[PDB]
């Protein structure tokens, strides 16, 4: 039994081995209690403000919209400590670990951004952090591995199975199934089994709450649409949550189209996958006809997941939120455009959200519209990727 509904309509649930159910129940209990606890809320607010730098700016982008009837604001999660929105919810989950009397954090990473976020939260709050990493990923990601170890996290190379993310995740959850009395598993997105999709949304919802207050102050009305990229769904549900009951506000989630939906080399399960059960949840996923989970693809590591948070599948199903895709080439053009016209280097993840807003403007340039893009992160990390693609197509 649970305190909260584990499902969003038909999507979500707790598809874990029986041995992990007490861990999920314990965490649900702690979360529900914490949400009632002014001291928890005050400690979380204190870390968000004084350590992470909230509130984040809301930037009006005049150069990029000049000559159109689009007004575009960027919610600047790129200015958060760590340079992406991931920081918000790892701080909340680290406080939940401490609430449950744990001294240890478990996480896994492929590209390294969630592992860095997990390690910085653990260093601040005096938690022992272990981060499981595919041996082939450890090889690729020397800078993220170095940042994690600089922050005192033990980075464990996993050589088992295919020596990659799914193998690191298996090891992490095996460890958690034995260690959950002393260790919290810090899930990096609004996906996985209940209660993680709920927790991650509530620990990201300040993105939208701030955006609403800032847009009302600056424009005296709500946005026509808020636009966010969708990898697992955390930055998007964090922007969306406070607008869900404002039914005039469009909610647009952008999945990675990769080389093009028609190629099969994409990360757009919500619109181009089909429902299955994996990683603890019933959700859209990319799979073979016989139900093996496919490999996703995106230029952007942060979006490269073959599934999505169940609350997004639900919002889509009822027509509350709309989901689209943006290709590698569209994201790259948005990345270049923001650099040149606003002096902001966006994360390639965030560049997918910006590319769709640029499309909304350019397709219908005489349409009056007030748009907010969630600028989920900064793109320092992406300059070598962008450099290599641009030199390899003759500076195009």
């Amino acid at each position: 039994t649970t305190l909260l509904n584990p499902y969003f309509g038909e999507f979500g649930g707790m598809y874990v081995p029986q041995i992990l159910m007490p861990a999920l129940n314990q965490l649900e209990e702690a979360f529900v209690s914490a949400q009632k606890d002014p001291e928890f809320q005050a400690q979380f607010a204190d870390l968000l403000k004084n350590y992470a730098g909230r509130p984040t700016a809301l930037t009006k982008c005049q150069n990029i919209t000049a000559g159109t009837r689009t007004t575009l604001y960027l919610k600047r999660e790129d200015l958060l400590h760590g340079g992406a929105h991931k920081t918000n919810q790892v701080l909340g989950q680290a406080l939940l670990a401490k609430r449950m009397g744990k001294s240890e954090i478990i996480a896994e990473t492929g590209a390294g951004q969630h592992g860095v976020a997990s390690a910085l939260a653990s260093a601040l709050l005096g938690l022992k952090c272990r981060i499981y990493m595919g041996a082939k990923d450890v090889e690729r990601q020397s800078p993220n591995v170095f940042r994690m170890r600089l922050m005192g996290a033990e980075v464990i190379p996993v050589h088992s199975g295919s020596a990659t993310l799914k193998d690191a995740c298996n090891e992490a959850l095996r460890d958690w199934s034995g260690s959950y009395e002393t260790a919290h598993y810090m899930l990096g997105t609004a996906a996985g089994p209940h209660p993680y999709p709920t927790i991650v949304r509530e620990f990201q919802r300040m993105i939208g709450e701030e955006t609403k207050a800032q847009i009302l102050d600056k424009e005296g009305r709500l946005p026509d649409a808020v636009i966010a990229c969708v990898g697992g769904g955390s930055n998007a549900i964090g922007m969306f949550a406070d607008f869900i009951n404002d039914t005039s506000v469009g909610l647009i989630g952008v999945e990675p189209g990769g080389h093009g939906i028609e190629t099969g080399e994409h990360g757009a399960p919500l619109k181009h996958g089909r429902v299955g059960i994996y990683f603890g949840m019933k959700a859209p996923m990319m799979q073979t006809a016989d139900g093996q989970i496919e490999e996703s693809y995106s230029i952007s590591a942060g979006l490269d997941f073959p599934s999505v948070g169940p609350q997004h599948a639900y919002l889509n199903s009822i027509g509350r939120a709309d989901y689209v895709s943006i290709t590698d080439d569209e994201a790259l053009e948005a990345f270049k455009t923001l650099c040149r016209h606003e002096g902001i280097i966006p994360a390639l993840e965030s560049s997918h959200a910006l590319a769709h807003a640029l499309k909304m403007m350019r397709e219908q340039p005489e349409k009056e519209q007030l748009l907010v893009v969630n600028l989920s992160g900064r793109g320092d990390k992406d300059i070598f990727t962008v450099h290599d693609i641009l030199k390899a197509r003759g500076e195009i």
Binding site: T1, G13, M14, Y15, V16, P17, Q18, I19, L20, M21, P22, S160, G161, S162, K166, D167, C169, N170, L173, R174, G276, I277, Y278, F279, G280, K282, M285, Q287, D290, G291, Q292, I293
Partner: protein, 258 residues
């Protein structure tokens, strides 16, 4: 599920425990897997637990993670696993066959259709590794409509509510992981709640552990990875693989006997 009833009745009349090996179907390929399974039966396996290779087996230790990869490397598919299961049943009419599945392979083409296919090929039970009793309703319903026993794990962190649910919802056998209430207590309470007979599935790698499981009041033991370690160990000599499997299963089965 009737095969399990008949087995346990026969074992009870012999004052005898069940010995049940696990293997991944198609590890290390389809033909050697069929020979492995026939060798497990000829050696005295009372029942089989058989895994279907899956892209993302988050619930298995390293030994089975690597069995899964070998079976993929051989290109083994669920359809080929179901052809293998029909061939196994056609050779061995009474031995209980249980599957160890992941939810996606069961849900993929319809839960009902999955259990209908299990019934057609002569499978007796299905344990879905990532479906806890809280999520089990449509799995156990489809199982029972197709005469398939739904197998539940009773973990070391079980409470009284979980023992009653497992006792109520399970058929065939209860999969006991005594990896935390004592072993004595769990077996006693499952019997009190009229659960399916308990098979101890934690750490069964030696004869003394099979005898200990029977002595504790369990109906038998499952060797969850020790059989797969013997395959991993002998990949270069298929003939030695079958000889070590036969002498291991013979010894483990001897340990169950009165």
């Amino acid at each position: 599920m009737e095969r399990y009833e008949n087995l346990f009745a026969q074992l009870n009349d012999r004052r005898e425990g069940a010995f049940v090996p696990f293997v991944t179907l198609g590890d290390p390929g389809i033909e050697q897997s069929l020979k492995i399974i026939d060798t497990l039966i000829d050696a005295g396996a009372d029942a089989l637990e058989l895994g279907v290779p899956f892209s993302d087996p988050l619930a298995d230790g390293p030994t089975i993670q690597n069995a899964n990869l070998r079976a993929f490397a051989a290109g083994v598919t669920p359809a080929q696993c179901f052809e293998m299961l029909a061939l196994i049943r056609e050779k061995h009419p009474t031995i209980p066959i249980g599957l160890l599945m992941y939810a996606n392979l069961v849900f993929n083409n319809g839960i009902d259709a999955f259990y209908a296919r299990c019934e057609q090929v002569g499978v007796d039970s299905v344990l879905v590794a990532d479906v806890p009793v809280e999520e089990s309703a449509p799995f156990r319903q489809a199982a029972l409509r197709h005469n398939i026993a739904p197998i539940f794990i009773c973990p070391p962190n079980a409470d009284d509510d979980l023992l009653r649910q497992v006792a109520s919802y399970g058929r065939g056998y209860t999969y006991l992981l005594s990896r935390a209430l004592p072993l004595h207590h769990l077996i006693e309470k499952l019997k009190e709640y009229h659960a399916a007979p308990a098979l101890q599935g934690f750490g069964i790698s030696s004869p003394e552990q099979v005898s200990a499981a029977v002595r504790a009041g369990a109906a038998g033991a499952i060797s969850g990875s020790a059989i797969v370690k013997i395959i991993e160990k002998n990949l270069a000599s298929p003939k030695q693989m079958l000889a070590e499997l036969r002498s291991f299963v013979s010894a483990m089965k001897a340990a169950s006997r009165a």
